[PDB]
Design a protein around this motif. Structure first.
Motif, mmCIF file in Angstrom:
data_model
loop_
_atom_site.group_PDB
_atom_site.id
_atom_site.type_symbol
_atom_site.label_atom_id
_atom_site.label_comp_id
_atom_site.label_asym_id
_atom_site.label_seq_id
_atom_site.Cartn_x
_atom_site.Cartn_y
_atom_site.Cartn_z
ATOM 1 N N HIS B 404 0.840 -1.193 0.000
ATOM 2 C CA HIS B 404 0.000 0.000 0.000
ATOM 3 C C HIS B 404 0.878 1.248 0.000
ATOM 4 O O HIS B 404 0.725 2.146 0.826
ATOM 5 C CB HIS B 404 -0.958 -0.024 1.188
ATOM 6 C CG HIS B 404 -2.097 0.941 1.078
ATOM 7 N ND1 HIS B 404 -3.239 0.827 1.838
ATOM 8 C CD2 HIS B 404 -2.270 2.039 0.305
ATOM 9 C CE1 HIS B 404 -4.065 1.811 1.540
ATOM 10 N NE2 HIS B 404 -3.500 2.563 0.614
ATOM 11 N N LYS B 487 -6.978 -0.089 -8.426
ATOM 12 C CA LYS B 487 -7.428 0.456 -7.155
ATOM 13 C C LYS B 487 -8.764 1.163 -7.340
ATOM 14 O O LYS B 487 -8.855 2.130 -8.091
ATOM 15 C CB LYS B 487 -6.369 1.419 -6.600
ATOM 16 C CG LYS B 487 -6.726 2.161 -5.313
ATOM 17 C CD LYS B 487 -6.866 1.230 -4.127
ATOM 18 C CE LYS B 487 -7.156 2.004 -2.852
ATOM 19 N NZ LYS B 487 -6.040 2.908 -2.464
ATOM 20 N N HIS B 489 -11.310 3.594 -5.580
ATOM 21 C CA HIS B 489 -11.134 4.582 -4.528
ATOM 22 C C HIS B 489 -12.351 5.488 -4.425
ATOM 23 O O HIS B 489 -12.943 5.878 -5.434
ATOM 24 C CB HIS B 489 -9.862 5.401 -4.755
ATOM 25 C CG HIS B 489 -9.243 5.925 -3.494
ATOM 26 N ND1 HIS B 489 -9.786 6.956 -2.763
ATOM 27 C CD2 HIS B 489 -8.121 5.553 -2.836
ATOM 28 C CE1 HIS B 489 -9.024 7.207 -1.715
ATOM 29 N NE2 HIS B 489 -8.008 6.366 -1.735
ATOM 30 N N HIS B 516 -10.869 0.789 -1.717
ATOM 31 C CA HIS B 516 -11.058 1.788 -0.670
ATOM 32 C C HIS B 516 -12.547 2.116 -0.705
ATOM 33 O O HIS B 516 -12.968 3.014 -1.437
ATOM 34 C CB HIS B 516 -10.216 3.005 -0.970
ATOM 35 C CG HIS B 516 -10.311 4.105 0.036
ATOM 36 N ND1 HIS B 516 -9.676 4.066 1.251
ATOM 37 C CD2 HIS B 516 -11.037 5.246 0.032
ATOM 38 C CE1 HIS B 516 -9.948 5.165 1.928
ATOM 39 N NE2 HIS B 516 -10.782 5.896 1.214
ATOM 40 N N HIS B 542 -6.929 -1.528 4.469
ATOM 41 C CA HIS B 542 -7.290 -1.050 5.809
ATOM 42 C C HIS B 542 -8.718 -1.437 6.179
ATOM 43 O O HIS B 542 -9.589 -0.573 6.321
ATOM 44 C CB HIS B 542 -7.072 0.466 5.969
ATOM 45 C CG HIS B 542 -7.554 1.279 4.816
ATOM 46 N ND1 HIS B 542 -8.840 1.179 4.337
ATOM 47 C CD2 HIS B 542 -6.920 2.168 4.016
ATOM 48 C CE1 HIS B 542 -8.981 1.982 3.303
ATOM 49 N NE2 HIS B 542 -7.833 2.598 3.089
ATOM 50 N N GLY B 547 -8.250 4.120 7.860
ATOM 51 C CA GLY B 547 -7.817 4.672 6.590
ATOM 52 C C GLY B 547 -8.982 5.060 5.706
ATOM 53 O O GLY B 547 -8.883 6.010 4.927
ATOM 54 N N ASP B 630 0.312 2.453 3.542
ATOM 55 C CA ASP B 630 -0.456 3.641 3.138
ATOM 56 C C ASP B 630 0.432 4.885 3.215
ATOM 57 O O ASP B 630 0.024 5.934 3.713
ATOM 58 C CB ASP B 630 -1.727 3.801 3.982
ATOM 59 C CG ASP B 630 -2.869 4.490 3.243
ATOM 60 O OD1 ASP B 630 -2.855 4.585 1.997
ATOM 61 O OD2 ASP B 630 -3.813 4.930 3.929
HETATM 62 NI NI NI Z 1 -7.330 4.334 1.227
#
Ligand code: NI
Ligand code: NI
Lengths: 837, 837, 140, 140
Positions: B404, B487, B489, B516, B542, B547, B630
């Motif tokens: 991450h 990813k 998000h 995410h 996370h 996060g 992260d």
């Molecule tokens: Ni994130």
């Protein structure tokens, strides 16, 4: 010790904080850098004690320094101080908010751990303007005008909170929101862009929705209403709502209408201009203070339609199907987009989004989603392959061009790019004696070596050769090897024969000729050099003569039509300390002795107050077109930009607004002065088509600035569409901001990437020889051109041609019969509020 | 000044020493780094005085600091302090041995030269565990079992001394040693390996020799008896002894027998377990404390036969014909060998030698010479082309994998590799606003640029694209360009439509999807995201949701079979300062105002103590399988390892040993937690066949740790069989140890060597396109695979699937109906004894 | 004659006495991918238009009789990035039934006509003596 | 020295070599049909071998340049895969340095009759109506 890199950088931060502590202890008012260093270091030490919690240090950091211990600009420059520190719990971030919030701070707290004597509050002297402030009108802008509007009633049947964004399609919200889903079709919340409405569990709220514009195509979300906005898709969406179990209750008596330019319209959402400028940056008619100067840049125009600003973040506009276009070809999407940027250029001062594609400025205008937004063209589409840079409240400027670099070391390259200079033109081979004095790269072997050594650096480079020869042979050889210009210098022989030879070679090869004329007047006076020009184009470095040239009347070249004049920075502006500095620096450079009359006579004949004061006026009226560095040869590479703006500030202080300017803004002066280090050097040297302005089709050599820091320290330098350098904090921080924040090199500086983003400017002869293949250069290589037909009238906004007359005895300078004289400036902006040393 | 490079480093050392001096002067107890800095700097200053000799400073350095001026761990961590200083007779090395040897030090000597007030001894507070200690049994091991043994009587007839090593062929010794050379044929001294017996001139001794084993072939020495051990070669050797004049005197009644497992056998040599562990490192049954933690790693097994340990040095085992093989093909010789290493891995905790060949872990077992030793296989031969790394008393661990990483700057790469992370997976392009929030590399242009910029770095790299789109077009484009994952998000749109699209693309391309999830619950709650998964594999970043993720119950994904969950380090473990840090960090990140009720409501809904306490239990029981960073996006790249072990320590403090563990060792917990950053990220991302464990055939990305410093600061990081980074001292020092000892980059980081040792992980689509040829990458490139059929049961040692339930109102978390609750930890290990700041 | 043999037909292999029978055929009768003037593989008819550019085949061999140790079949062979991307029925999923996403003929797809031709894997010769480079040309 | 060798059949010496080896690798050779069972069958032609293909021909040869060019590293500027060496020892050479051909006769030519004398003795040779190494060997 086994010191990791973060321990080394934190030790540097501690050293800076201890310097700030000593300065505070002896009773000087700290600047921005010193205050940040002190606060960060003291937070680290209080964490090292282990007797405090993070909240205790959040409260304590606001008490260390007051308004009386810092310069008057620091309370506005300094909003917060992030720092990481090792508590007994481990490493924790702690951030101070508004650290300067009292008249006086707790000096025992500020100097804790240093074992220094705490000074009394009397020791801090007393003596204002806000750097980077946005001056707005007292008007409320109105969002989403000329749209169909409906006021609906929504209630949350969920047990968890539900925020919904401004541009999210409202028919596709969480199924546990009950409302008239038929009347929410093709609608979005009529609120400020990037904001949201929160539905706590059970919460009931009356919202206002306005129609989407553009093609009116709904994508993403829950895929309830995937398609264009029409009746058949409305019926399909309602069937999907009923089938999938999305909360729907008809509200037959909902309020319907249109958003108007009416204060008393129930469907309109208003936003104050100050709130608008805070949220998205200034719009048309606002004004920006450039750093701590007195210059006000007014936004001439703004491409944004209010309500549709491209804002990136959590629950904001740039998202799939809302502000990020989704149903377009992948190959028209921008590579990068700088959003909501204030662009200061010689063409104008505007507000726009800058789309970057393949390393070039693809477009300037309004970006977003043409499915959802009006006024989005096909060269401004934000797709799923588009990176976002936030330009809200930042100024975008073209990377500066420094046309008088002496390549004495490679560290001046880092110093230049850290200050926003993206292109260097000059000559040299290292600290050899020939290049400490001259911008000449004599040998073709050295030309190859320097093109190879600078191949990985993320800057544009141009190298010049030694044109001081009475026969054309070696000049041809060095032009063929890569030299994009030649340099006539007093130290190699700048006689009329050399001038004639170099100029005929230039006409042959279509390169620019830079000249440093004969200060000794050994072959002739300035009229004889001008005669040797024979009306041919020539660039004159340091035309005033402080850098050098015919004593005392080299400045007359500012009146010649075919001469392109330039100035070097160390005299920009004339100040109280300029003459002593320059005189004794000249004595050091030339190994002169003050006790021998001839040496001091030469020094005094060459360093003249009157002619420098005239240089200031000639810069103001546009008689001098370029401001360069002369780096490490009576010049500072990292002050081409700042010194320029300092000059502008001085000329607004002691002459008022220009004729074209008014009491409202300084737009014409700002354009004239920003042309002096962006576009005029590019035109003079012959690569104006690639660099020198924020224009479509040019290389994306951009520099971001905070308006409060404009002209001193940029936020980031973008080279060819990628961030070459940037302000970044601790690498082991939880976020990028914590101290020590340094201007560090980014991924644009590593491997073979730095060469992929930049251009090596050579002559046409060298490109015909394919020196990029011979030398194995990874960088792009382009030929310079269009430099032999140039006159003074081709310099943008700096085309004045006064009739200059210098007195041989008193050195008094008259332009068109009027004496040129300006007072010495005892202070300058952009210097003391910003720099640690 | 003309400062040479070493003066700059010594100035940094002096600055660190002065910081330590100020801290000592205000009365805090110094840690290891501060104590070393103070002692080195003060020795330098006393040398600068010129009134002391090197011996005087050797004696003085032991009196500067006492046990009461340093933390209780420092006397064990700090064995010596080497430093190089300029005396009046030139530069000399002076080293302090056992510098902490008194209750109280001489504080006027410690603070000499600083001009600081000497603090009274009362100012140092009062309040033990030994970091890295070896807990051995009270047993004597017996060397060289089951060998033919003879006790001979040797006498020296030389005039100067003759020392003989443990493995030197005794018939080959100096001709001036007289003894029965017939009974010494095929024999070596029966003593501890690496030791010696010294014969002073005229000295007369009685020695015990045991037979060599293996093939029993004698090589090297004086070439008296080259060849296999038999009767004919014995007669040839005796003829050579007589002819060449080697001391020989028959001893008819020499004692002969066999070495037994019997304490009272006259031919046996015994060594205590403490002496054995000090000399060669711990063996089977011993225990090692991991840093200053609670955890004890017990050696499950040992590949070494006692007596034939491979030790390198002067007169030690690894020498021509004794421990370095001589009669084998050059090709099967190892490129390098780590000797006597304690290997901690998710497979086990063992003691072995690691042979590396062609950059891969060639073998794990017993190295040496099959001519002289038993139990040496052909893949473990130390030849004349074999480099030696001494793992005696050090721990070898696989390089960590950080899955991450936000590529916000290139300095986090240095920070990561200096802490033992050898592989980074993530996304970014620099400090652009899009990558400070998300691990997305959107543009293919940026993908090419980032693969080219990281081409020379000695780390493995994997880049992910932006999967937040509702159509697959740009996702195909970015996967084809090099992206090894996508990813989803919240900042780009993490709605169910985007999830479905990204997951079907993942099933097509055999890449992993990191998500995410939507914290606003704008399109759905967590159940709707799980429905959008449709039972397809997905990595969840996370999973707790500090996060980010569905407020408050993203943690439910820890119970889903197809979801691979992970946690980020800043919440690892819950401590007293975590909530305030994370709340205000979120406030600065999202630009939230504490005074606006909606903003604070969102912030409190996202940062929850109960779920941050839940993730500790979920990591302990194995419900969370990966620990990531992260980095610089609410995350610290250089704390993935340490924080992990901190959590392990906490969960042993507050829950005791796991079910599979006992009161003896913590091997199962150690394996479970080391799997969380070595192998589980590799399995999740799809390159577990190359990296992630100390296994034969995998890349030799190794990290060597001192046991006292395990989890904080490694001794060296080896990348592909070459030392990439290492703790090294002054470049101008006489030896590598003197201060300032910093973790510096080694020859693995220079030129085109860093790419020669690493792998760039891309998709299969990109490897089919040969992006390593298109982009001109010198780095090795491999395709990720086997990531779509993965379930929770494929994560090693972290395959638990609790039934998670979160309360909507109180945020209380239950696993299988049982409340999950952990107390806040007021301290952690691996933080304060080790780091300067 | 028009499209090549279908299921149940037989093909004589050269002038040998061996008959290869088509074990099965992926084609739906009526939607054969034929390239030419006014033929199936055209924009919006047999060349897909509304799909991502990056799932288009690089090349397609149409109406091919594939003889292999696995079987003797009739299919279209889609090639992408130099690998056999798929074997089956090619065409346009907008207009045709039985077209999977790995068999889409786009505007970036080259066409090879396998109508009435046999497709075979390139032979592997495991006992070559590299005595000259001209045997390489003779072999290929 | 470099292994630039030529192998000849003694019956064919001086006309047609059996093979030309360049830098230890057979550069050219007399070889027959590529599809022959052995290398000998007709048409036997002098063909280029694997030494002539790819980047192998440069790996076996030397490009002789001046010292000034090698100091400039023209092998790097021009991107030459061939080995490059500088020529030397050519300015102090006399006739006596030529091996086995170091004679220095005193030559005198008549301006009118073109009669040549070496050390005062007439030099004269009869015309040869036949030469070897020509007609037994060459088709044309
Ligand atoms: Ni994130
Ligand atoms: Ni100059």
């Amino acid at each position: 010790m086994k010191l990791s890199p973060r321990e080394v950088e934190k030790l540097g931060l501690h050293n800076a904080g201890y310097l700030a502590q000593k300065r505070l202890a002896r009773g000087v008012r700290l600047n921005y850098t010193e205050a940040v260093a002190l606060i960060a270091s003291q937070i680290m030490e209080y964490a090292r004690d282990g007797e405090k919690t993070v909240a205790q240090l959040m409260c304590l950091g606001q008490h260390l320094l007051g308004r009386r211990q810092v310069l008057p600009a620091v309370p506005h420059l300094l909003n917060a101080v992030q720092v990481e520190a090792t508590f007994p719990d481990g490493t924790k971030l702690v951030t101070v908010h508004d650290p300067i919030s009292r008249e006086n701070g707790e000096l025992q707290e500020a100097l804790f751990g240093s074992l220094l004597p705490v000074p009394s509050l009397d020791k801090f002297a007393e003596t204002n303007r806000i750097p980077g402030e946005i001056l707005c009108e007292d008007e409320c802008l109105t969002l989403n005008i000329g749209r169909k509007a409906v006021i609906l009633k929504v209630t949350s049947k969920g047990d968890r909170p539900i925020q919904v964004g401004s541009h999210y399609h409202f028919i596709e919200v969480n199924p546990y929101l009950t409302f008239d889903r038929r009347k929410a079709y093709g609608m979005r919340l009529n609120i400020a862009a990037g904001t949201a409405v929160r539905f706590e569990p059970g919460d009931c709220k009356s919202v206002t929705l306005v129609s989407i514009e553009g093609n009116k195509v709904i994508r993403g979300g829950n895929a309830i209403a995937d398609g264009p906005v029409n009746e058949t898709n409305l019926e399909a969406a309602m069937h999907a709502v009923r089938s999938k179990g999305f909360g729907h209750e008809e509200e037959k008596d909902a309020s319907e209408g249109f958003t108007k330019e009416d204060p008393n319209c129930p469907f309109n959402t208003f936003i104050h201009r100050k709130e608008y400028a805070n949220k998205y940056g200034p719009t048309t008619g606002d004004k920006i203070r450039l750093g701590d100067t007195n210059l006000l840049a007014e936004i001439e125009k703004d491409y944004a339609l209010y309500g549709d600003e491209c804002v990136f973040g959590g629950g904001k506009v740039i998202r799939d199907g809302m502000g990020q276009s989704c149903g377009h070809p992948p190959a028209i999407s921008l590579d990068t987009v700088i959003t909501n940027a204030v662009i200061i250029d010689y063409t104008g001062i505007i507000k726009a989004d800058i789309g970057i594609k393949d390393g070039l400025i693809a477009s300037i205008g309004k970006a977003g989603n043409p499915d959802i937004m009006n006024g989005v063209f096909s060269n401004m589409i934000i797709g799923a392959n588009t990176e976002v840079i936030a330009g809200e409240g930042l100024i975008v400027t073209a990377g500066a061009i420094d046309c008088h670099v002496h390549y004495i070391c490679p560290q001046l390259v880092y110093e230049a790019i850290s200050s926003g200079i993206t292109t260097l033109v000059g000559g040299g081979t290292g600290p050899a004696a020939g290049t400490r004095a001259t911008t000449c790269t004599p040998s073709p072997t050295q030309m190859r070596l320097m093109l190879q050594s600078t191949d990985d650096l993320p800057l544009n480079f141009g190298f010049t050769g030694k044109g001081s020869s009475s026969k054309p042979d070696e000049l041809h050889e060095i032009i063929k090897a890569g030299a994009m210009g030649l340099k006539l210098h007093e130290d190699w022989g700048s006689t009329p024969a050399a001038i004639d030879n170099c100029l005929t070679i230039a006409e042959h090869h279509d390169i620019q000729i830079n000249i440093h004329t004969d200060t000794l007047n050994e072959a002739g006076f300035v009229e004889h050099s001008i005669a040797a020009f024979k009306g041919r184009t020539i660039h004159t470095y340091h035309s005033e003569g402080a850098g050098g040239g015919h004593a005392p009347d080299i400045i007359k070249v500012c009146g010649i039509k075919n001469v392109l004049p330039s100035s070097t920075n160390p005299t920009r502006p004339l100040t109280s300390n300029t003459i002593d500095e320059h005189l004794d620096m000249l004595m050091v450079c030339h190994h002169l002795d003050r006790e021998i009359p001839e040496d001091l006579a030469f020094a005094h004949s060459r360093i003249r107050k009157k002619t420098i004061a005239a240089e200031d006026v000639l810069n103001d009226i546009g008689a001098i077109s370029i401001i360069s560095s002369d780096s490490q040869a009576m010049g500072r590479v990292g002050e081409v930009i700042s010194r320029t703006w300092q000059t502008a500030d001085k000329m607004k202080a002691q002459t008022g607004p220009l004729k074209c300017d008014s009491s409202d803004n300084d737009n014409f002066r700002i354009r004239r002065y920003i042309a002096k280090y962006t576009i005029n050097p590019a035109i003079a040297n012959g690569f104006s088509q690639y660099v020198g302005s924020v224009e479509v089709g040019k290389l994306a050599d951009l520099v971001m600035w905070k308006p409060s820091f404009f002209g001193t320290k940029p936020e980031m330098v973008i080279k060819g569409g990628m961030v070459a350098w940037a302000d970044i904090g601790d690498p082991n921080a939880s976020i990028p901001t914590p101290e020590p924040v340094k201007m560090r090199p980014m991924y644009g500086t590593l491997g073979k990437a730095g060469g992929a983003l930049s251009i090596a400017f050579v002559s046409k002869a060298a490109l015909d020889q394919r020196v990029n293949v011979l030398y194995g250069l990874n960088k792009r290589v382009e030929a310079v051109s269009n430099v032999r037909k140039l006159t003074k009238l081709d310099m943008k906004l700096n085309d004045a041609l006064p009739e200059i007359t210098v007195d041989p005895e008193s050195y008094t300078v008259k332009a068109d019969g009027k004496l040129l004289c300006v007072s010495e400036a005892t202070t300058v902006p952009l210097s003391r509020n910003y720099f640690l040393f």
